[PDB]
Symmetry: C4
Subunit: 336 residues, 4 copies
């Protein structure tokens, strides 16, 4: 019974547990490169992806993101025709990159075919639990039919799950169980891995195969994004930080003379029903209207450039490979 003895051995770190250590630098924030290659046909100018959620990304959001040099994932809480047309809407807007989310269902192959005929640039096969035979089988199935299509699969949190996805044929792994700002998985199911540990463990494995990972969830400030990249992610995915912006879908409601938008987990009661007996693992809330996406992105990327300047990272490869962290106690959060 080795599993009995190992039950409490693992330790995990999240964003707040840690800081990046400054090192010798020859490169100003304005002159560092923030480009990343997820694959030969998916090269991003900035390492940011907007979440495939129904209160985050439709055509308008994905267009704005692609123009900033990033990528948007069109969500799956709409019919096949609606999504294929959302993708097409982005592609016709001047050779912009776009991705699209698909559930591991019977109709997945149908949906994917329409998305591919619409010339999608990457499909996202993500469930709440990526380390499942369902996901593995679907990825194998899609890979066999579409040898050249970019497949992002997730979400996972372990090296073991990362290996299973890579061998099933995914060329990008999305990492994150439990860190979402709208996520209640930790409270409902008692399940999760602190996000910095998950990213580093998954990346350790992925690097062996030259596969990139996406850090998905829990990024609350630009500094967290720099941390997530330095822990080994090629790119980060944001929900909450993008939900307040003009280009995100949803009405801008006014309560108390303050403009707000609705942001909700895809595992919330409302979302789960638009996606048609599980217990909800997400909540529904309001975020402040942030204005146009461009302002949020320039602030994020600016945070990252400053981070890279301190680390002496000329490019993101250096950051992933060489940046060092120092660990602090909870009292170390107050000092900041």
């Amino acid at each position: 019974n080795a599993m009995w003895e190992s039950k409490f051995v693992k330790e995990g770190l999240t964003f707040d547990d840690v800081l990046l250590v400054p090192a010798k630098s020859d490169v100003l924030p304005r002159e560092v490169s923030v480009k990343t290659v997820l694959s030969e046909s998916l090269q991003l100018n900035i390492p940011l992806i907007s979440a495939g959620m129904d209160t985050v990304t439709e055509a308008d959001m994905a267009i704005a993101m692609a123009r900033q040099g990033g990528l948007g994932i069109i969500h799956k809480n709409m019919s096949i025709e609606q999504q294929a047309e959302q993708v097409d809407k982005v592609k016709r807007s001047g050779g912009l990159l776009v991705g699209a989310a698909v559930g591991v269902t019977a109709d997945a192959m149908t949906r994917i075919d329409a998305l591919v005929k619409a010339s999608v640039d990457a499909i996202v096969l993500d469930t709440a639990h990526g380390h499942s035979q369902g996901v593995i089988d679907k990825v194998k199935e899609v890979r066999a039919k579409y040898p050249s299509l970019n497949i992002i699969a997730g979400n996972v949190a372990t090296a073991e799950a990362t290996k299973a996805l890579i061998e099933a044929g995914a060329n990008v792994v999305k990492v994150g169980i439990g860190p979402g700002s709208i996520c209640t998985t930790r409270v409902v199911a008692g399940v999760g891995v602190p996000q910095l540990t998950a990213v580093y463990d998954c990346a350790t494995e992925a690097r062996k195969h030259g596969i990139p990972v996406i850090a998905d969830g829990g990024i609350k400030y630009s500094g967290d994004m720099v941390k997530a990249l330095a822990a080994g992610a090629h790119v980060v995915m944001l929900g909450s930080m993008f939900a307040g912006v003009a280009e995100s879908p949803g009405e801008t409601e006014i309560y108390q003379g303050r403009q707000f938008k609705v942001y909700r987990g895809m595992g919330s009661v409302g979302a789960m029903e638009k996606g048609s007996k599980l217990v909800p693992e997400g909540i529904e809330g309001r975020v402040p209207y942030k204005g146009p996406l461009a302002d949020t992105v320039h602030q994020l990327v600016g945070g990252l450039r400053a981070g890279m300047g301190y680390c002496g990272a000329q490019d993101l490869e250096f950051l992933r490979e060489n940046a060092q962290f120092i660990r602090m106690s909870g009292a170390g959060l107050l000092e900041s």
Copy 2:
């Protein structure tokens, strides 16, 4: 001086200290089995027991629990005759399982004979301190007279105490010193053991004998329940989470339009008064009314099923044996 040198060596974890790690799964939440076997004559469809507290479980609660696949323990803050008819009332509802609390007093044997006569399915011999000669001796005496009766004995929080209860004749051990929501033991006495550490330590001992443990107390969320089962408990006992439901004893009070219900420790001033020099070790508060028990159980089991889904646990045995935790700092509890 060996004991002097080891005073501060031990470390313990509570629920908020850890998360379960996802693992290879091929079983959906709806497909998983949540059945649990405590003995060959006490088999539960869901791993949930309602606390034997005078504001949590009487016959109505025990009936609603048995129907959902769990078990209620009829509290002992009432006469022998009152307790025996409560038990018989539950059994009247069509062979439902029911348990009954018994204190450790010279009274105890009389009460138990009445509960056996009324067909209890299990007796709970529990005191604040399970690792005491009094409790040991009473279990010995009860086992001698009733070879086949299910005896649950607690509360304990160490392997050493678990072993003692098992050797006396308890076939189920109840674990938890200090974790309860209404418990002031750790403030008044300075005594307690972090509940995941206690469950795991007692499980480690009890497994050697094939004896199940109950994780008793401290469970606020359904995730905490999944953590308790994964740390080695067969089943959990809840007071707080059940106290506001319609089936629990007690009047629904209305303050400022809001329906409340009173919940108190059995070591509170009020409870100790009803059950008759010790300083109180429990408080008395109000919890929100929550409607029918069924709605509360369904969310709990749902949370558990999601948990087993992420773990690949096709049943509770896999969960106890295989699930792995990861530990985090307090700053990691904020996400």
Copy 3:
């Protein structure tokens, strides 16, 4: 430079860091013994001492404490005649034990002589910093003149300081730098030792010589007292928990229809001036009126009896020698 390398090696625990582990018990709370022998002529029925502070202990408080089986220390913020008469007042109240505080000053010997002529039962030579040549010299001086007098010296926090006091001739060591509820030493001077660590370290050393220690400061609940005893103290000293009671000196003022009493550190601005260029290391505040001392004591002792019942301690010697602690994280404070 060994001291450079060792600068950050020590770890310390306070009350909240820890819990007592239940063990096999044959003894009910009502039948355990809480008596302690500090010396052949100073035997206490309950292990409690009230602080020698000007808002805590005068004759009335020391009388009430002695009758409960404990001990009160008459404070030194009064003239010699006033204190000698305060002591006498206690002794004439029917053979009650009493102690008296003295500062390490030139006039210390004068004050002590009057206290001894008044038949004091123990003098307390405590300063803010007991590990000082001033305190050592005074203790030697008093021991040489009064071979039989009980001398409690403090306050100290290390094994080294405990050894220095014991060898200078103190027969009881009072432990505590920084844990006081009214103490700002930690914020003003950056100086302190977490109280459980200090008690255990000091006791480890004192046991070698058969000398008892007093845990002084930081006890906020009865459980902390059980912890302090289990960490090796013979007895505990309380300030704040006794300052609200009827027998404590000071006016009972009413603000908002609520009765309050004034409690202040002896290093506070107000106290330091009644004791006649240092920076204040204590504050001044209000505590709720608690009624008669008897109620507070019965609650404290009750907490301790319950603690002993859980530990299976028939007497305090067992608790000191055998009780085991388990350490918890800060999240472990919430569970309680």
Copy 4:
């Protein structure tokens, strides 16, 4: 892959993490020496420097500091001619010590020549990132032209950076990346080092060369200052604690009867605007007016004297070399 494996090994402590341990003392607080020598031509009576920030130090502040036995750094958010007359104003007040901030720009040498001409006692070459080729090269060039001028260079937070600044010619190193009260670096960039760990790491390197360090930032209480000196700094620099005093630049604002003063990071939007594409790394707030500098210094030095009293430190060298800390948990910060 060695760097990959060591990503998470390092641990760091801040002020709230530790306390100083009392030790054998025979020296009273009034008897202790708080004098500190930075170089043979910059000797301070008290180990305190006011920050070179446009809401902390101009000539009035620098004069009041020099009189108390410390030093002020004239900030650089003003023209060369303005800075040189500020410096000359302080020197006019009877040979008081004064320092001046200089940015790392092509401008820098011109400004420094004007400051040298005005008789500065020390120049502070400091940027957000001290461990940069730009800063190294500028110190090299300044040392070459001015062999005997005191050069303070920062900010840094590693032994490696400390060594680099020393080899370039800095004779004093300023330490602190992220600890400041108005600093948002750790949130915007994710970058920083816990201030006691940084000071100690840089001290460890600098001692090998007999070079002093300044602990810059994060000091809220006088105890924090004692901790910084004991972790190996010769002296501390304060912004926050000095910003509300009468001598600091800035108008006293009155809101709801309460006198406030504005305090902002030099990397705030407002400061960056006055000092002329980077994202802001500092905030702008108000601190309470605190009256004369003298009252603030007296409490600080008093706190320090008590600290050295408990430590047995008859002087600052003993404190750096001998004082021992003890580490505590966050629950131990609550007492």
